[PDB]
Amino acid sequence: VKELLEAGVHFGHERKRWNPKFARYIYAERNGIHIIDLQKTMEELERTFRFIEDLAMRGGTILFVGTKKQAQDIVRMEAERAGMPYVNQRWLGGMLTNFKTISQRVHRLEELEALFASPEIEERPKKEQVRLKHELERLQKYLSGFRLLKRLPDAIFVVDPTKEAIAVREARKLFIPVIALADTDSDPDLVDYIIPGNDDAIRSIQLILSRAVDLIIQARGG
Amino acid sequence: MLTDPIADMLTRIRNATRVYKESTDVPASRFKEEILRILAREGFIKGYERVDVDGKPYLRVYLKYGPRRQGPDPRPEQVIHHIRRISKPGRRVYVGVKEIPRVRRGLGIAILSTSKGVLTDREARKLGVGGELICEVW
Amino acid sequence: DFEEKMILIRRTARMQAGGRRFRFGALVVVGDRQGRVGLGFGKAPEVPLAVQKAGYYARRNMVEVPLQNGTIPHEIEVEFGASKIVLKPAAPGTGVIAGAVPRAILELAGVTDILTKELGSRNPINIAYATMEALRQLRTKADVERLRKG
Amino acid sequence: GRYIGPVCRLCRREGVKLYLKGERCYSPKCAMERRPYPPGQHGQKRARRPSDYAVRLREKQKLRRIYGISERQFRNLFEEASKKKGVTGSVFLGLLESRLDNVVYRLGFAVSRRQARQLVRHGHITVNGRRVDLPSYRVRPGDEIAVAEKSRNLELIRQNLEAMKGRKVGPWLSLDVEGMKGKFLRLPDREDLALPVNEQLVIEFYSR
RNA sequence: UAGCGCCGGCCAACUCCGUGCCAGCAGCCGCGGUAAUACGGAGGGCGCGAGCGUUACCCGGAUUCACUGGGCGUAAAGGGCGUGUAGGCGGCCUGGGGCGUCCCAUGUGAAAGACCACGGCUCAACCGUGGGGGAGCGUGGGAUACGCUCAGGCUAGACG
RNA sequence: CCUGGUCCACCCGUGACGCUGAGGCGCGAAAGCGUGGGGAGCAAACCGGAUUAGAUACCCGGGUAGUCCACGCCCUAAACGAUGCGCGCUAGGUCUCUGGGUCUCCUGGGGGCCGAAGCUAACGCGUUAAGCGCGCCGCCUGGGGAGUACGGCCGCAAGG
Ligand SMILES: [Zn+2]
């Protein structure tokens, strides 16, 4: 799929906190705010989306990451739609470098889910009960989407690259491709497949991700 | 005051690539042009053209780089890895033909200036001449 | 396959109240004598344990070394902040000429003839590290043509 | 004092069999057979990792001790091997194998190297017609290294050649048992040597 | 005929006994106050061999006087500041000269030595014979980018 | 009132007239030296008071030189950014003094903080470089002994 000239939604976000390297993606300043040149965002989308089709039909896995408060309720949604994994609540340092050590945390969920169905529930100390009840509680937060990761992902779809420069760092080191919805404040020089655009705006995050996923699905043929 | 023209040139080029510029302006001159003729000719740079910079004649040297790297920090292998005036003013170093230096097991080059023209090591040695050894680039 | 080669192990110290709790440090070099050398620096509470770790680090990040008939395709001086190392290719027969450290690293690079020279601070660690960046910079007459393309 | 003392003590220190006695260093006993541990009270002890010099050292020694030459001459050879064009290592070995004494060994006129020297210093060796008692004599290619007319009827040499019916001679050498002669065809090549050494380690050694 | 040094690290070579911050070793770090691979003997071991050690001295390691190839915020190191003398160094275009500078030819650069090769004395040390190389300077011829110089022109430095 | 530096705008005028800078000459905090004037406050030394094991101090009360002025000498310093001068080159953000502009923004010079590339032993530095570079001067080359000794130069002396 392709997009329209939907310009009533992305056309810049941040004030004057920008990163000089982003210049290549700005139109001009208006009322002290940078405005992204959309004619250019179209040139980038037409490539990034290419990458995803490639990935998708090749049957790949894209980890969706966005710890921003605004994208919270969106990230959850979209990933769930492919079969994609995602990082909603908070991004754990090493969910990719130290994966084998974290995937261990995953098994801890697996093993607890089990106990809370089996007969060994109320039967045994209750102090531990609470103690164990809380552990799932926390897991069913952070790991909620990571769970789907059988092995490290073929690409990451990050939202605020500068906020998730930890995730990006990691990936960058493990040679996993980076796809992010970036703008004024990011270092484009580190994002394999950029998507220059506003993002605090639900209206922006929502569009950028939906059109991506629709790409994802139509790619596999559903 | 500008004391050494060529060094300022070379040095404008180094200082650029490091920050990865598409091109770099530089005051022009019937020599700085001849040196630049080589850099392009060898392949260290795309090229250069005369440009009018505020009434003043300049040289737009078109920088060249390597591909985008993988893993972290994809700052491209530099094409012009190293570059430095050998001969400086107040220390001009001239060389005999038998004395022209091999650079980087022959991989880099050496730009001289002979009574026969601004040359490379290879060309110089071919011509059987030598002179003011301008700089080492590799 | 890969051959381990310990460069050096030091016992480093800390300070707690009452004791000076110690720690060990190991520098290992790895390689296949073909031309891919690793290099780790493992710290651990016990020595066997240190090396057992250093070994880990090394095998993870090697360096494909160009090898033109045993020697190196071109000299390269390499400042590592404080230490400086000099690699200069030699002819068949002169054999490796370095010290305890660079030797070790080149040896597994499968280098066979070569002229070195250490300069500045001679710190096993840094010199070692230098020697790597050093090898990482080597380029073939191929690799240069391919770079100065148009 | 060109050595001369306990021999299979070295067969032992190096861990590699050193053919220093010919017969016997083939019978269950060059000592390495059944007793590979080095000499001394400490033979049976665990050996700590050999420092770079250490390895370079013993590898030099293994070579030297093989031909049994005094370091003084060994060094000199290496020195002159470096002035020649070629591979500083293979060229070494070349000269080494060019020694009158050594040749007599390869030609088979002697049980071992040691025995070969004596054969020369007692004058049982002709060379292009004239005898020679100086082992350090370097045999050029195309030389007729023979045996003393006088010495042909020897209880030793005689029993040796009898053994040569069955053994092949170094590819770079020829010999006419029926006439107790033999020639030096050319400087043998490294790919033509069997030594258990590592030249590179010997060269490395001399750059300290 | 076989000897001499060494066996804590550097540095190849480890045990017993004597001793007990003594006697002594020791290039440097250090060793020795009753468990000494560091003192003294011994067995044993390593190294070298009519030699081995020692002291002295030269170069080296020492890019630790740094031409090659160093430095100066706090490690030793910016002059208390300015003024300007001698000196060093100096922008763009054009031409002449061609001093520096580069190329060529030529004379010189004795011999011995070093180097390569062939040979001589049973080898080698030693020696002979032949070949090749060279910086520097003389003379002649040439080149003119760059430095220098003279000339003419510019305005981006400076100054008004 | 007399006088130096400097910045901006216009781009008008000269036409490279430039940078550095051994020795030299000038400037050079505080204290201190000569002659004279002056002397409120403060205050070395000195006079007493208290504190203390003691107090030749820290605290309290006095107090002379001095500290203020003129002319002259002295010339040192954590005389510090502990960072020589001059030119070019290499993301920005922000605060501030100051000039021009079409002045919710552009543009010049200066002072601060944060910070890219890069540098750095690290701390840190970072278009006010400790970055990439060229010119020129100054200086360092283990600690102590010593800024001493000797010698010379300077000064009235203290001394430098
Ligand atoms: Zn034997």
Side-chain angles (χ1 to χ4, degrees), chain A residues 33-75:
Chain A
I33 293 175
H34 294 98
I35 283 191
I36 309 178
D37 183 20
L38 293 152
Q39 275 195 5
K40 289 192 174 182
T41 308
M42 294 307 268
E43 284 191 64
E44 287 297 314
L45 271 194
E46 210 170 70
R47 194 178 73 132
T48 286
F49 278 27
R50 108 182 312 289
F51 185 56
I52 299 170
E53 183 176 273
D54 172 64
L55 256 228
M57 43 181 278
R58 180 144 281 240
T61 302
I62 286 163
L63 209 210
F64 276 99
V65 182
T67 310
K68 200 183 186 305
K69 219 298 167 61
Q70 307 312 107
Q72 187 178 105
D73 281 87
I74 307 184
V75 174

Side-chain angles (χ1 to χ4, degrees), chain D residues 118-135:
Chain D
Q118 205 181 78
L119 281 164
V120 187
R121 256 297 255 113
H122 286 10
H124 303 320
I125 306 292
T126 314
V127 158
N128 204 17
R130 281 76 179 189
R131 72 170 160 273
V132 180
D133 63 271
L134 308 151

Side-chain angles (χ1 to χ4, degrees), chain D residues 34-59:
Chain D
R34 300 185 166 206
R35 290 177 195 188
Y37 48 116
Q41 179 173 123
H42 314 278
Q44 294 190 126
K45 285 181 170 173
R46 181 199 182 202
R48 299 178 180 190
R49 186 245 298 183
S51 61
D52 298 54
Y53 170 59
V55 198
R56 266 86 200 159
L57 211 212
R58 271 306 133 39
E59 202 72 19

Side-chain angles (χ1 to χ4, degrees), chain C residues 7 71 103:
Chain C
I7 272 315
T71 193
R103 171 187 316 212

Side-chain angles (χ1 to χ4, degrees), chain A residues 113-141:
Chain A
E113 200 278 90
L115 300 202
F116 288 63
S118 97
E120 306 175 35
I121 306 171
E122 183 176 62
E123 294 279 295
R124 267 306 177 184
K126 287 184 180 179
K127 294 186 175 177
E128 288 179 81
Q129 187 216 305
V130 186
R131 281 244 300 230
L132 292 193
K133 215 303 186 306
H134 291 343
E135 289 205 319
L136 281 170
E137 283 278 279
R138 70 135 49 206
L139 293 171
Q140 296 201 87
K141 277 198 179 181

